[PDB]
Amino acid sequence: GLTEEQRMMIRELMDAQMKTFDTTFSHFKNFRLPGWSQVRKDLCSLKVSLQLRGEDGSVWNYKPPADSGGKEIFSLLPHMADMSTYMFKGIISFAKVISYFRDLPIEDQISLLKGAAFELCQLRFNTVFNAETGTWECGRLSYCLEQLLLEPMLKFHYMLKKLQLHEEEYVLMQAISLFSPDRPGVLQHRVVDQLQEQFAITLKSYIECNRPQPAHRFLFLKIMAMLTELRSINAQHTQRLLRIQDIHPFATPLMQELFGISLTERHKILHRLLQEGS
Amino acid sequence: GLTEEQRMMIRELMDAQMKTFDTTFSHFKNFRLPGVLSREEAAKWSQVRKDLCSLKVSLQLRGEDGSVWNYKPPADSGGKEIFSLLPHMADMSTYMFKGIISFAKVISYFRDLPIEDQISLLKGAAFELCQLRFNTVFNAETGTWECGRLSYCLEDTGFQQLLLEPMLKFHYMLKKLQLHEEEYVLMQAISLFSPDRPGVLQHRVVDQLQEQFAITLKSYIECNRPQPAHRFLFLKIMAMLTELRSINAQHTQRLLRIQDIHPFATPLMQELFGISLTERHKILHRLLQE
Ligand SMILES: CCC[C@H](C)Oc1ccc(C(C)(C)C)cc1NC(=O)c1nnn(-c2cc(C)ccc2OC)c1C
Ligand SMILES: CCC[C@H](C)Oc1ccc(C(C)(C)C)cc1NC(=O)c1nnn(-c2cc(C)ccc2OC)c1C
């Protein structure tokens, strides 16, 4: 079985997830709505329609335009920036209530969240992804996709959903991604690296104590391979986001902070959120 | 053929329609849309839910980029969700009525009547002329009123069930007649010049005027359509106009009942509903004056 400290480690991560992940998206408000070639082709694969279900029973449905070559390909990017910002704020709170993360220097806290923001966001998105309908079910909001598995982020969501992970395995993936000692700007490398290794050992122990079926053979090494793949997808899409923001500005002030290539000065919003409570 | 007096009478109506009917709804802007995300009073509330459930549509809004916003209405759950579209339809009705006001203003026959009879005629005919213009953009195949970039599609709340609703039976039957523009605009004049509206004083004048429009329409049909096949088209049109007046009274009473428990009417609509004739209709009076 799991050791006591591993039991406590999982318990703290799960408690953090429950306290900082609003799976109903009920507090997502005041978002915007609709009024290089490799990017355009990739943006075509991820084309989604937006459905908003009101409490009264009504449904607003947005179908995106077709690719005509103009600025029509970015009609949903302002909205997704507001959704990404809301999602990241939950990620910040998730990290803040973790004991191992809260004790790191403030700049390493900034650097870790900066390097893992997209990765923990995609991990939480996967838990609301419906692989049958191709829809991310975000409470009252739904995002339904329109060979398309060629796109890496799309392929990632299908591959990860196929593993049928438990909540504990998702939250341990989040901790492994969060405590990456090789993020730019990290100073406490050995401290963060020692923390990451214990999360990975905890995940391996959890899988062996709860997943005996042959369908879950090599599941731990599959998860670690998925985490390395997600870090690659992070680099591609962050770089892709900078090109788009250059051409058509869409990023919220908090997102611009993530995209900037002193530490607390360049990240005033993230710095304030790390100092605020919950 | 038609006499020249009937010819110029049609020319004036067609000219009126061309200048005041925004058929593409291009200048319908800044409208409201549904938001994103006792004892005898129970009888008044129960009655309104029956009024609002017979007529249910989804709203479609097409953007210039090619995108499509679509609104699907909620189901009757007992709350205010049954009024989710009344703000929009208040803005649409107001926009249409102002076009109807302008339509009557440029007809010389209507301009020469006393201002209080003009108020009384537009008050009694506003709904009817609005439905008549709505029918010209009504698609009977898809059950959709196509108002430029806005579309209102009937929901299958069967069809023989929907045909029971007189306002929907009106739009399907009138569309099936496949009327010309001239016949629609003559229906509008016959409806506008109804001598039996409340508050009209020059009834004999308005009746003579209505009869000349009706005779003009009857003559138009005899001279412009194959004789045997359209032998009763004029009588069908007049029968449609007679039913439209009953639909007018029926739906005007529904609006007053809804306004009682859930106000939604714009100021110009409040004047039309009854919420000196000139002092009770200051907005409509001002629009007729300019
Ligand atoms: C709600 C579910 C969205 C699905 C999972 O996905 C999309 C599907 C469609 C589309 C478009 C608009 C192209 C149709 C976009 C996206 N997804 C993004 O817009 C996006 N997802 N994560 N992040 C991001 C987040 C951080 C913290 C930091 C950096 C980040 O980007 C590097 C962003 C900006
Ligand atoms: C543009 C397509 C709408 C179709 C044709 O129709 C409806 C379909 C659905 C609905 C609801 C909201 C119930 C789903 C309403 C309505 N229609 C009205 O809301 C309405 N149509 N004409 N008028 C009206 C106008 C005047 C000048 C004077 C008086 C009038 O009402 C007595 C009004 C207020």
From Swiss-Prot, chain B:
Protein residues bound to hyperforin: S93, Q131, L132, R133, F134, H251
Keyword Ribonucleoprotein: no
Biological process annotations from GO: cell differentiation; cellular response to molecule of bacterial origin; intestinal epithelial structure maintenance; intracellular receptor signaling pathway; negative regulation of DNA-templated transcription; negative regulation of transcription by RNA polymerase II; positive regulation of DNA-templated transcription; positive regulation of gene expression
Main location: nucleus
Expressing tissues: Expressed in liver, colon and small intestine.
Keywords: Activator, DNA-binding, Metal-binding, Nucleus, Receptor, Transcription, Transcription regulation, Zinc, Zinc-finger
Gene Ontology, cellular component aspect: chromatin; intermediate filament cytoskeleton; nuclear body; nucleoplasm; nucleus; transcription regulator complex
Function per UniProt: Nuclear receptor that binds and is activated by variety of endogenous and xenobiotic compounds. Transcription factor that activates the transcription of multiple genes involved in the metabolism and secretion of potentially harmful xenobiotics, drugs and endogenous compounds. Activated by the antibiotic rifampicin and various plant metabolites, such as hyperforin, guggulipid, colupulone, and isoflavones. Response to specific ligands is species-specific. Activated by naturally occurring steroids, such as pregnenolone and progesterone.
Subunit comment: Heterodimer with RXR. Interacts with NCOA1. Interacts (via domain NR LBD) with CRY1 and CRY2 in a ligand-dependent manner.
Family the UniProt entry places it in: Belongs to the nuclear hormone receptor family. NR1 subfamily.
This protein's name: Nuclear receptor subfamily 1 group I member 2
Species: Homo sapiens (Human)
Full protein segment contained here: 142 to 431 of 434
